[PDB]
Short mmCIF file of C-alpha atoms in Angstrom, two decimals:
data_model
loop_
_atom_site.label_atom_id
_atom_site.label_comp_id
_atom_site.label_asym_id
_atom_site.label_seq_id
_atom_site.Cartn_x
_atom_site.Cartn_y
_atom_site.Cartn_z
CA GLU A 7 0.00 0.00 0.00
CA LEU A 8 2.98 2.44 0.00
CA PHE A 9 3.16 2.28 -3.79
CA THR A 10 -0.59 2.30 -4.41
CA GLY A 11 -0.85 5.64 -6.21
CA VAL A 12 1.49 8.38 -7.36
CA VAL A 13 4.37 8.87 -4.89
CA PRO A 14 6.48 12.08 -4.68
CA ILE A 15 10.20 11.55 -5.13
CA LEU A 16 13.15 13.70 -4.03
CA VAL A 17 16.72 12.87 -5.22
CA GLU A 18 19.98 14.37 -4.02
CA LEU A 19 23.48 13.71 -5.24
CA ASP A 20 26.95 14.90 -4.23
CA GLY A 21 29.69 13.90 -6.60
CA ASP A 22 33.31 14.25 -7.46
CA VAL A 23 34.65 13.20 -10.84
CA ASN A 24 38.42 13.61 -11.20
CA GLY A 25 38.52 16.33 -8.55
CA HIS A 26 35.50 18.27 -9.80
CA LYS A 27 32.70 18.53 -7.31
CA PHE A 28 29.07 19.06 -8.20
CA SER A 29 25.64 18.56 -6.73
CA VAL A 30 22.33 17.65 -8.32
CA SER A 31 18.81 18.09 -6.92
CA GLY A 32 15.82 16.37 -8.46
CA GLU A 33 12.09 16.10 -7.89
CA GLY A 34 9.40 14.01 -9.46
CA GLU A 35 6.66 11.37 -9.04
CA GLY A 36 6.51 7.62 -9.45
CA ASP A 37 3.66 5.24 -10.21
CA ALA A 38 4.53 1.59 -9.65
CA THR A 39 1.09 0.67 -11.00
CA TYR A 40 2.26 1.67 -14.51
CA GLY A 41 5.96 1.44 -13.78
CA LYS A 42 6.36 5.06 -14.78
CA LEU A 43 8.73 7.78 -13.44
CA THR A 44 8.95 11.48 -14.26
CA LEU A 45 11.88 13.26 -12.63
CA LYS A 46 13.49 16.66 -13.15
CA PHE A 47 17.09 17.28 -12.12
CA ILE A 48 19.05 20.53 -11.75
CA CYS A 49 22.84 20.85 -11.31
CA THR A 50 22.85 23.11 -8.29
CA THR A 51 26.53 23.93 -8.49
CA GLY A 52 26.58 25.43 -11.97
CA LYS A 53 27.36 23.35 -15.05
CA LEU A 54 27.56 19.58 -14.77
CA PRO A 55 31.15 18.45 -15.40
CA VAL A 56 30.08 15.14 -17.03
CA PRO A 57 27.34 14.40 -19.58
CA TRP A 58 23.81 14.11 -18.13
CA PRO A 59 23.16 10.68 -19.67
CA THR A 60 25.99 9.20 -17.53
CA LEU A 61 24.04 9.97 -14.32
CA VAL A 62 20.68 8.49 -15.35
CA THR A 63 21.15 5.05 -13.74
CA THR A 64 22.51 6.69 -10.59
CA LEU A 65 19.78 9.29 -10.24
CA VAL A 67 14.68 4.25 -7.72
CA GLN A 68 13.85 0.74 -8.94
CA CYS A 69 11.10 0.36 -6.36
CA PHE A 70 8.88 2.01 -8.97
CA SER A 71 9.02 -0.92 -11.38
CA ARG A 72 5.76 -2.59 -12.35
CA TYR A 73 5.82 -6.14 -11.08
CA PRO A 74 3.06 -8.17 -12.67
CA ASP A 75 0.79 -9.98 -10.15
CA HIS A 76 2.32 -13.41 -10.74
CA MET A 77 5.72 -11.87 -9.97
CA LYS A 78 4.65 -10.09 -6.82
CA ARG A 79 6.73 -12.24 -4.47
CA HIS A 80 9.97 -11.29 -6.26
CA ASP A 81 9.74 -7.59 -5.52
CA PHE A 82 12.74 -7.11 -3.27
CA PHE A 83 12.59 -3.32 -3.73
CA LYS A 84 9.14 -2.62 -2.33
CA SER A 85 9.34 -5.39 0.26
CA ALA A 86 12.28 -3.50 1.84
CA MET A 87 10.16 -0.39 2.41
CA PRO A 88 9.70 1.90 4.19
CA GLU A 89 12.99 1.42 6.07
CA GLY A 90 14.53 1.43 2.62
CA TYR A 91 17.67 -0.14 1.19
CA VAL A 92 21.19 0.75 0.30
CA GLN A 93 22.18 0.69 -3.33
CA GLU A 94 25.84 0.49 -4.26
CA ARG A 95 27.36 0.40 -7.72
CA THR A 96 30.64 0.37 -9.59
CA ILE A 97 30.04 1.59 -13.09
CA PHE A 98 32.93 0.88 -15.47
CA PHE A 99 33.13 3.06 -18.58
CA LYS A 100 34.89 1.04 -21.24
CA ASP A 101 38.35 2.38 -21.97
CA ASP A 102 37.73 5.17 -19.54
CA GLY A 103 37.14 5.75 -15.85
CA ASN A 104 34.64 4.56 -13.32
CA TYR A 105 31.95 5.83 -10.96
CA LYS A 106 31.56 4.34 -7.51
CA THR A 107 28.23 5.24 -5.89
CA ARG A 108 26.45 4.58 -2.62
CA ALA A 109 22.82 5.54 -2.05
CA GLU A 110 20.15 5.11 0.54
CA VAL A 111 16.63 4.90 -0.80
CA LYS A 112 13.83 5.14 1.65
CA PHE A 113 10.68 6.94 2.70
CA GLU A 114 10.99 10.14 4.63
CA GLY A 115 7.46 10.98 5.56
CA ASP A 116 5.34 10.39 2.47
CA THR A 117 8.19 11.14 0.02
CA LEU A 118 10.50 8.49 -1.42
CA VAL A 119 14.07 9.87 -1.06
CA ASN A 120 17.20 8.78 -3.03
CA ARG A 121 20.40 10.24 -1.44
CA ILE A 122 23.60 9.56 -3.31
CA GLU A 123 27.33 10.11 -3.07
CA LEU A 124 29.34 9.49 -6.20
CA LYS A 125 33.05 9.36 -6.83
CA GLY A 126 34.54 9.04 -10.32
CA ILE A 127 38.23 8.59 -11.11
CA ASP A 128 40.58 7.72 -13.96
CA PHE A 129 38.59 9.53 -16.59
CA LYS A 130 40.39 10.56 -19.73
CA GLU A 131 40.47 14.28 -20.34
CA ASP A 132 39.67 13.71 -24.03
CA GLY A 133 37.39 10.70 -23.76
CA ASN A 134 33.66 10.62 -24.41
CA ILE A 135 32.72 11.46 -20.87
CA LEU A 136 34.89 14.50 -19.91
CA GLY A 137 35.03 15.35 -23.61
CA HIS A 138 31.22 15.43 -23.65
CA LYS A 139 30.84 13.37 -26.78
CA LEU A 140 27.63 11.69 -25.71
CA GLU A 141 24.30 12.36 -27.45
CA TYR A 142 21.53 13.53 -25.17
CA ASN A 143 19.36 10.41 -25.44
CA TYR A 144 19.01 6.90 -24.04
CA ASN A 145 18.55 3.33 -25.25
CA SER A 146 16.59 0.39 -23.81
CA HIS A 147 18.27 -2.23 -21.63
CA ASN A 148 17.45 -5.21 -19.41
CA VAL A 149 18.47 -4.99 -15.73
CA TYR A 150 19.31 -8.50 -14.44
CA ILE A 151 18.55 -9.47 -10.86
CA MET A 152 19.53 -12.34 -8.60
CA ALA A 153 19.26 -12.90 -4.89
CA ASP A 154 22.27 -12.56 -2.60
CA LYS A 155 21.03 -14.67 0.27
CA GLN A 156 24.10 -14.19 2.49
CA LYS A 157 23.49 -10.44 2.48
CA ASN A 158 19.67 -10.64 2.63
CA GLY A 159 19.68 -8.66 -0.61
CA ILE A 160 20.14 -8.84 -4.32
CA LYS A 161 22.93 -8.49 -6.80
CA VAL A 162 22.21 -6.76 -10.10
CA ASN A 163 24.10 -6.46 -13.34
CA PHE A 164 23.61 -4.80 -16.71
CA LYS A 165 25.38 -2.94 -19.45
CA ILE A 166 24.32 0.47 -20.81
CA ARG A 167 25.11 1.57 -24.34
CA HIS A 168 25.51 5.31 -24.65
CA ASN A 169 25.37 6.76 -28.16
CA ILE A 170 28.42 8.84 -29.07
CA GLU A 171 28.07 11.77 -31.45
CA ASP A 172 30.23 10.11 -34.12
CA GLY A 173 27.84 7.16 -34.40
CA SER A 174 29.72 4.67 -32.17
CA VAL A 175 28.74 3.51 -28.69
CA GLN A 176 30.29 3.95 -25.22
CA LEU A 177 29.63 0.92 -23.03
CA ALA A 178 29.12 1.36 -19.29
CA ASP A 179 29.20 -1.83 -17.18
CA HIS A 180 27.09 -1.82 -14.04
CA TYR A 181 27.62 -3.96 -10.96
CA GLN A 182 24.97 -3.36 -8.33
CA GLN A 183 24.30 -4.50 -4.81
CA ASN A 184 21.19 -3.69 -2.74
CA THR A 185 20.95 -4.54 1.00
CA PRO A 186 18.10 -3.62 3.34
CA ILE A 187 18.42 -0.83 5.92
CA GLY A 188 15.89 -2.47 8.26
CA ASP A 189 16.53 -5.68 10.22
CA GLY A 190 13.53 -7.79 9.24
CA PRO A 191 12.87 -10.40 6.60
CA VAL A 192 12.69 -9.23 3.02
CA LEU A 193 11.60 -10.82 -0.31
CA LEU A 194 14.58 -12.58 -2.10
CA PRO A 195 13.71 -13.10 -5.81
CA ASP A 196 14.30 -15.80 -8.32
CA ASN A 197 16.38 -14.63 -11.27
CA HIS A 198 14.45 -12.14 -13.41
CA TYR A 199 15.10 -8.80 -15.09
CA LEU A 200 13.59 -5.32 -15.43
CA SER A 201 12.97 -4.14 -18.99
CA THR A 202 13.89 -0.46 -18.65
CA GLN A 203 13.32 2.36 -21.12
CA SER A 204 14.23 5.99 -20.69
CA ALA A 205 13.69 9.28 -22.54
CA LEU A 206 15.47 12.59 -21.87
CA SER A 207 14.43 16.11 -22.68
CA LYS A 208 14.73 19.67 -21.58
CA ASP A 209 12.19 22.09 -20.08
CA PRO A 210 12.52 24.91 -22.68
CA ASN A 211 11.87 27.51 -19.95
CA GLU A 212 14.52 26.21 -17.52
CA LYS A 213 17.68 28.30 -17.48
CA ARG A 214 19.70 26.05 -15.17
CA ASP A 215 21.58 22.97 -16.32
CA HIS A 216 19.01 20.20 -15.98
CA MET A 217 17.59 17.00 -17.36
CA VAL A 218 13.97 15.98 -17.59
CA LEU A 219 13.76 12.14 -17.35
CA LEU A 220 10.83 9.84 -18.19
CA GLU A 221 11.35 6.25 -17.46
CA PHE A 222 9.23 3.08 -17.80
CA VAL A 223 10.21 -0.17 -16.07
CA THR A 224 8.48 -3.55 -15.99
CA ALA A 225 9.71 -6.81 -14.49
CA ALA A 226 9.83 -9.92 -16.63
CA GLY A 227 11.64 -13.24 -16.89
CA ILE A 228 9.43 -15.35 -14.67
CA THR A 229 6.51 -17.34 -16.12
CA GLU B 7 -0.25 29.27 -34.22
CA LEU B 8 -1.67 25.80 -35.11
CA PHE B 9 0.93 24.13 -32.92
CA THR B 10 0.81 26.66 -30.08
CA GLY B 11 -0.56 24.39 -27.35
CA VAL B 12 -1.55 20.77 -26.97
CA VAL B 13 -3.13 19.42 -30.19
CA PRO B 14 -5.39 16.31 -30.31
CA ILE B 15 -4.19 13.60 -32.67
CA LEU B 16 -6.12 10.77 -34.36
CA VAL B 17 -4.23 8.00 -36.28
CA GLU B 18 -5.70 5.32 -38.51
CA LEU B 19 -3.94 2.51 -40.30
CA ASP B 20 -5.02 -0.26 -42.67
CA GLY B 21 -2.36 -2.81 -43.39
CA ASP B 22 -1.57 -6.07 -45.04
CA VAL B 23 1.59 -8.00 -44.24
CA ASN B 24 2.03 -11.18 -46.28
CA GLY B 25 -1.72 -11.50 -46.85
CA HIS B 26 -2.77 -10.76 -43.27
CA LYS B 27 -4.96 -7.72 -42.91
CA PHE B 28 -5.27 -5.66 -39.76
CA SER B 29 -6.31 -2.20 -38.69
CA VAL B 30 -5.05 0.06 -35.92
CA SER B 31 -6.76 3.07 -34.33
CA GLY B 32 -4.89 5.52 -32.16
CA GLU B 33 -5.55 8.70 -30.21
CA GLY B 34 -3.33 11.10 -28.37
CA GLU B 35 -2.00 14.66 -27.98
CA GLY B 36 1.05 16.49 -29.24
CA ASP B 37 2.95 19.51 -27.93
CA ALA B 38 5.44 20.95 -30.41
CA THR B 39 6.53 23.41 -27.72
CA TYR B 40 8.21 20.52 -25.85
CA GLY B 41 8.42 18.18 -28.81
CA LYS B 42 6.41 15.62 -26.89
CA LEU B 43 3.83 13.05 -28.10
CA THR B 44 1.61 10.66 -26.15
CA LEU B 45 -0.38 8.26 -28.31
CA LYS B 46 -2.37 5.11 -27.58
CA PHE B 47 -3.02 2.55 -30.29
CA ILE B 48 -5.42 -0.41 -30.40
CA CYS B 49 -5.44 -3.22 -33.01
CA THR B 50 -9.09 -3.08 -33.94
CA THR B 51 -9.07 -6.34 -35.85
CA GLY B 52 -7.93 -8.63 -33.05
CA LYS B 53 -4.27 -9.47 -32.51
CA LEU B 54 -1.60 -7.60 -34.43
CA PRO B 55 0.14 -9.98 -36.84
CA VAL B 56 3.53 -8.20 -36.54
CA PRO B 57 5.37 -6.87 -33.48
CA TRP B 58 4.16 -3.46 -32.23
CA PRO B 59 7.65 -1.89 -32.30
CA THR B 60 7.75 -2.35 -36.12
CA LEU B 61 4.83 0.09 -36.54
CA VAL B 62 6.15 2.92 -34.35
CA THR B 63 7.74 4.99 -37.14
CA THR B 64 4.66 4.50 -39.30
CA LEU B 65 2.12 5.38 -36.64
CA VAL B 67 3.56 12.82 -37.07
CA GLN B 68 6.87 14.70 -37.26
CA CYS B 69 5.11 18.05 -37.27
CA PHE B 70 5.26 17.77 -33.48
CA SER B 71 9.04 18.11 -33.31
CA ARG B 72 10.48 20.99 -31.30
CA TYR B 73 12.33 23.28 -33.65
CA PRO B 74 14.50 25.69 -31.73
CA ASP B 75 13.92 29.38 -32.62
CA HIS B 76 17.07 29.72 -34.71
CA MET B 77 15.89 26.73 -36.74
CA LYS B 78 12.36 27.98 -37.27
CA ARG B 79 12.73 28.52 -41.01
CA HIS B 80 13.61 24.84 -41.59
CA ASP B 81 10.33 23.45 -40.32
CA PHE B 82 8.91 21.93 -43.47
CA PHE B 83 6.36 19.93 -41.47
CA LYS B 84 4.45 22.76 -39.81
CA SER B 85 4.87 25.12 -42.75
CA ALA B 86 2.84 22.64 -44.85
CA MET B 87 -0.15 22.89 -42.50
CA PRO B 88 -3.08 22.84 -42.34
CA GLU B 89 -3.50 21.42 -45.86
CA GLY B 90 -1.06 18.79 -44.69
CA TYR B 91 1.47 16.62 -46.49
CA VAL B 92 1.86 13.15 -47.84
CA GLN B 93 4.39 10.89 -46.22
CA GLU B 94 5.65 7.85 -48.10
CA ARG B 95 8.16 5.28 -46.95
CA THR B 96 9.84 2.04 -47.91
CA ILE B 97 11.12 0.37 -44.80
CA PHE B 98 13.59 -2.46 -45.48
CA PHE B 99 14.00 -5.04 -42.72
CA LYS B 100 17.47 -6.47 -43.05
CA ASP B 101 17.42 -10.06 -44.26
CA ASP B 102 13.66 -9.96 -44.20
CA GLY B 103 10.75 -8.23 -45.88
CA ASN B 104 9.66 -4.68 -46.36
CA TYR B 105 6.82 -2.30 -45.56
CA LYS B 106 5.64 0.23 -48.12
CA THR B 107 3.47 2.96 -46.59
CA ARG B 108 1.60 6.03 -47.78
CA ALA B 109 0.02 8.51 -45.37
CA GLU B 110 -1.70 11.82 -45.45
CA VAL B 111 -1.16 14.00 -42.41
CA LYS B 112 -3.30 17.02 -42.03
CA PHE B 113 -5.76 18.92 -39.88
CA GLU B 114 -9.36 17.89 -39.93
CA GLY B 115 -11.07 20.51 -37.86
CA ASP B 116 -8.91 21.07 -34.79
CA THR B 117 -7.50 17.51 -34.79
CA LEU B 118 -4.27 16.50 -36.50
CA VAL B 119 -5.05 13.29 -38.46
CA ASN B 120 -2.53 10.65 -39.72
CA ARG B 121 -4.23 8.20 -42.17
CA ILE B 122 -2.07 5.35 -43.36
CA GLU B 123 -2.13 2.38 -45.69
CA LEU B 124 0.64 -0.15 -45.30
CA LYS B 125 1.65 -3.14 -47.37
CA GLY B 126 4.35 -5.59 -46.27
CA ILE B 127 5.70 -8.46 -48.36
CA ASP B 128 8.52 -11.00 -48.46
CA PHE B 129 8.60 -11.55 -44.74
CA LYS B 130 10.11 -14.76 -43.49
CA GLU B 131 7.73 -16.96 -41.58
CA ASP B 132 10.44 -17.65 -38.97
CA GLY B 133 12.21 -14.31 -38.96
CA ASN B 134 12.19 -11.76 -36.16
CA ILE B 135 9.14 -9.96 -37.42
CA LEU B 136 6.53 -12.71 -38.12
CA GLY B 137 8.31 -14.83 -35.52
CA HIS B 138 7.76 -12.03 -32.99
CA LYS B 139 11.28 -12.05 -31.66
CA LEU B 140 11.41 -8.34 -30.97
CA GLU B 141 11.59 -6.93 -27.42
CA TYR B 142 8.86 -4.47 -26.57
CA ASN B 143 11.08 -1.39 -26.32
CA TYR B 144 12.76 1.26 -28.48
CA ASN B 145 16.14 2.89 -28.94
CA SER B 146 17.15 6.46 -29.84
CA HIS B 147 17.92 7.46 -33.42
CA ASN B 148 18.60 10.54 -35.56
CA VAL B 149 16.19 11.24 -38.44
CA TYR B 150 18.09 12.93 -41.30
CA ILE B 151 16.39 15.53 -43.47
CA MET B 152 17.21 17.21 -46.76
CA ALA B 153 15.19 19.29 -49.17
CA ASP B 154 13.85 17.84 -52.41
CA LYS B 155 13.40 21.06 -54.32
CA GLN B 156 12.02 19.47 -57.50
CA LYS B 157 9.13 18.03 -55.49
CA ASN B 158 8.67 21.05 -53.20
CA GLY B 159 9.29 18.65 -50.32
CA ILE B 160 11.90 16.81 -48.36
CA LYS B 161 13.62 13.49 -48.46
CA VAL B 162 14.37 11.74 -45.17
CA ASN B 163 16.50 8.78 -44.23
CA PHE B 164 17.38 6.87 -41.09
CA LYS B 165 18.00 3.43 -39.71
CA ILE B 166 16.18 1.92 -36.71
CA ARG B 167 17.77 -0.74 -34.53
CA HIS B 168 15.22 -3.07 -32.99
CA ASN B 169 16.39 -5.20 -30.08
CA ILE B 170 15.83 -8.93 -30.59
CA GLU B 171 15.14 -11.17 -27.61
CA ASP B 172 18.40 -13.09 -28.04
CA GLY B 173 20.48 -9.92 -27.58
CA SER B 174 21.15 -9.12 -31.27
CA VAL B 175 19.63 -6.30 -33.32
CA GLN B 176 17.25 -6.20 -36.32
CA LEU B 177 18.02 -3.23 -38.56
CA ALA B 178 15.18 -1.47 -40.39
CA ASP B 179 16.22 0.98 -43.14
CA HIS B 180 13.89 3.89 -43.75
CA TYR B 181 13.57 5.90 -46.94
CA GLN B 182 11.05 8.71 -46.62
CA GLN B 183 9.53 11.29 -48.89
CA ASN B 184 7.16 14.10 -47.82
CA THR B 185 5.34 16.31 -50.39
CA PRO B 186 2.75 18.98 -49.62
CA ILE B 187 -0.98 18.43 -50.25
CA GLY B 188 -1.61 22.15 -50.79
CA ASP B 189 -0.39 24.14 -53.82
CA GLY B 190 1.42 27.04 -52.15
CA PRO B 191 5.00 27.72 -51.18
CA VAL B 192 6.42 25.73 -48.31
CA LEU B 193 9.62 25.93 -46.18
CA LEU B 194 12.51 23.82 -47.74
CA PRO B 195 15.18 23.15 -45.07
CA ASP B 196 18.91 23.00 -45.02
CA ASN B 197 20.23 19.58 -44.02
CA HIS B 198 19.49 18.85 -40.36
CA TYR B 199 18.17 15.96 -38.29
CA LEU B 200 15.59 15.18 -35.61
CA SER B 201 16.92 13.53 -32.46
CA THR B 202 14.07 11.12 -31.70
CA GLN B 203 13.49 9.06 -28.57
CA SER B 204 10.62 6.73 -27.87
CA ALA B 205 9.28 4.68 -24.95
CA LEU B 206 6.60 1.95 -25.11
CA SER B 207 4.35 0.61 -22.42
CA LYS B 208 1.01 -0.95 -21.79
CA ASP B 209 -2.12 0.36 -20.04
CA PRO B 210 -2.50 -2.41 -17.41
CA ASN B 211 -6.30 -2.07 -17.60
CA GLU B 212 -6.55 -2.36 -21.41
CA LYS B 213 -7.71 -5.77 -22.58
CA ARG B 214 -7.26 -5.15 -26.31
CA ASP B 215 -3.94 -5.50 -28.13
CA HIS B 216 -2.44 -2.03 -27.85
CA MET B 217 0.66 0.07 -27.44
CA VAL B 218 1.08 3.20 -25.38
CA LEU B 219 3.78 5.40 -27.04
CA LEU B 220 5.64 8.40 -25.59
CA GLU B 221 7.93 10.14 -27.93
CA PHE B 222 10.24 13.19 -27.69
CA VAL B 223 11.68 14.83 -30.80
CA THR B 224 13.93 17.87 -31.18
CA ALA B 225 15.56 19.25 -34.32
CA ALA B 226 19.30 19.81 -34.38
CA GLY B 227 22.20 20.03 -36.81
CA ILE B 228 22.04 23.70 -37.68
CA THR B 229 24.07 26.27 -35.72
#
C-alpha cells in the first residue's frame, strides 16, 4: 500500500569526478502501477562536469511494475519503508569509473534517493569528460539475482551510450542492494527489469538540468 | 499558431503484411513546444500480426520541437493545415519490407494521420513474423534534406530493434514528404531530428495495444 498511487520523489546527489565537485537536486513522481517515473534534475553547483546521460542510472527501482504473478519477487518494495542501500561500480569502457552509494527510503510520504558518487581515472579527451555523448538513451534489461548471504540482491547490466560520431560507449554496471531495516525481506528468483528511458529539456529552464521519463516492468518469470 | 498548445491527434492505419490484414486506431496529444507526443493505439481487428515496435515509425513529425534559430527549416508545420503526404519504404534487413503512404493534415482542430501499409517477403520464422522483438525502443537521428524538385523533403534513417536473443534487427527507412496544398512551403537545409521513444502498456486495457511516448527535437544547424 505504499506504492498504491502516485508517490512524490526527491533525489539528491553529491559527486566528485576527477577532482571536480558538483551537486544535483531532483524532484518528481513515481507510479509503480504503470511502472512510470517522471523526474526533473538541476545541477545546483553550476554546469555539470560530465554528460547528463551518464548519471541516469545513478539518479529508484522500487517504482518498477511487477506483474501480479511476480509479486513475491519484488525485493525493492518489500524492503520499504525502512529502505535499502544501493551500491554500484560503473565501469566506462576504456575510460574511468563511478563508484556510488545511495540510501533509498521513505521520509514521511516522500520516497528519497540520497547519493554520493566518486569518479576517477577519466580521460580528459574521452567521451565522458570530452562530452561526446548524445543527449538520449537506449533500452536495456536490468538483471537481478538474490544474494542470500546479504539478505539482498545483486544486479548487473550494461548500458550503451550513443556517441556523437555514431559509435557507442559501453558502461558496465555492478549493483548491490541490501536492506536498511533488520527484518525479513523478499529474495527473488532470477528475473530482469525491462527499462526504457527518454530525456528532454524544459525549454523555460535556465539552469543545467535533465527531464527524465522512465518506464520499467519486471519480466523473466513465467 | 496551429501548434501553439496541446493538439489532439487521431491516427488510422489499414495494413496487409504477407496476406494478413489488420487495422489500428490511435488517439493522443502532441505539444510541439516541448516536442512531446503521447499516443495510444489499439489493433481493432484482433491481434496484431507483426510486433508493435515495427509500426512505431509508421504510426507525425510536425510535433518536433524546432529551436527558434531553426524555425525557417520546419517543413512539417509550414505545410499545415493542408497537410502533407508521407511515403516510406522500410527495409527489414534479411527480411521483408513495408511500403506505406500517409496523409497527415488537420481535420477541424485535430491533426489526423491516415495510413495504408503493405508488407511483403517476410520470413515466416524471422524476427518480425516470428515475434522475436523486445517491446522497447532505442534512440535514433532522423536525417532531413530538401527535395526542391518536389517542393518537399527526403528523409533517411536506420532503426535498430532489439531482438530477444540480444542481437539487433536493422530497419532501413527511406522517406519522402510532399505537400498536399499548392502554395509555397519551407525547404530546409540539411538537419536531423533527435528522436526518442518509450513503449508501455495500459494495465487495464484488454485489447492489443501500445502506449507510445515520444520526444523529438531538431538539431544540426548552428
